[PDB]
UniProtKB/Swiss-Prot annotation:
Induction: Up-regulated in breast, uterus, colon, ovary, and stomach tumors. Induced in breast cancer cells overexpressing NCOA3 or treated with estrogen. Down-regulated in 5-fluorouracil-resistant derivatives of the colon cancer cell line HCT 116. May be a transcriptional coactivator of the nuclear receptor ESR1 required to induce the expression of a subset of estradiol target genes, such as CCND1, MYC and E2F1. May play a role in the recruitment or occupancy of CREBBP at some ESR1 target gene promoters. May be required for histone hyperacetylation. Involved in the estrogen-induced cell proliferation and cell cycle progression of breast cancer cells. Highly expressed in estrogen receptor positive breast tumors and in osteosarcoma tumors. Residues 3-114 form the Bromo domain. Disulfide bonds: none annotated. The chain holds residues 981 to 1108 of 1390 of the full protein. Interacts with ESR1 and NCOA3 and these interactions are enhanced by estradiol. Interacts with acetylated lysine residues on histone H1.4, H2A, H2B and H3 (in vitro). This is ATPase family AAA domain-containing protein 2. It is found in: Nucleus.
Length: 130
């Protein structure tokens, strides 16, 4: 129905706004673009499903997300990819892991404050009807 298409359009507006607020934070610069094959040719042999915030905006606009739960699966993949690729005790690995961690926790805290639970449940019930 047109009412259901207005629901998904409001979801996309909400997801674009959260993603922009993450992408401008200086801590999260390393998560804003795909890893460069040249600089790191090993990355795509270890990490089987790369993800970054530029790819997330493109996915919003392609109508890939019909719920906030499916958006958060991609934010969780950004933060699990960085934990798995950079697991060592040295300062450079520890700095990306504390930050990858800060990106996950910040996304979940904005959603807990600003997403209405009944809006999410509506999106879930429209998705489950299709
Ligand atoms: C203060 C530096 O930042 C942190 O310690 C943030 N948390 C992590 O790195 C978690 C515990 C972790 C560690 C490892 C070895 C593998 C997967 N996750």
């Amino acid at each position: 129905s047109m009412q259901e298409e207005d629901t998904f359009r409001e979801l996309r507006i909400f997801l674009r706004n959260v993603t922009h607020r993450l992408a401008i934070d200086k801590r999260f610069r390393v998560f804003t673009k795909p890893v460069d094959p040249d600089e790191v040719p090993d990355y795509r042999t270890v990490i089987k499903e790369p993800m970054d915030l530029s790819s997330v905006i493109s996915k919003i606009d392609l109508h890939k997300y019909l719920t906030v739960k499916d958006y958060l699966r991609d934010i969780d993949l950004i933060c699990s990819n960085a934990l798995e690729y950079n697991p060592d005790r040295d300062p450079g690995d520890r700095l990306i892991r504390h930050r990858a961690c800060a990106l996950r926790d910040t996304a979940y805290a904005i959603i807990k404050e600003e997403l209405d639970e009944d809006f999410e449940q509506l999106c879930e019930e429209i998705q489950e009807s299709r």
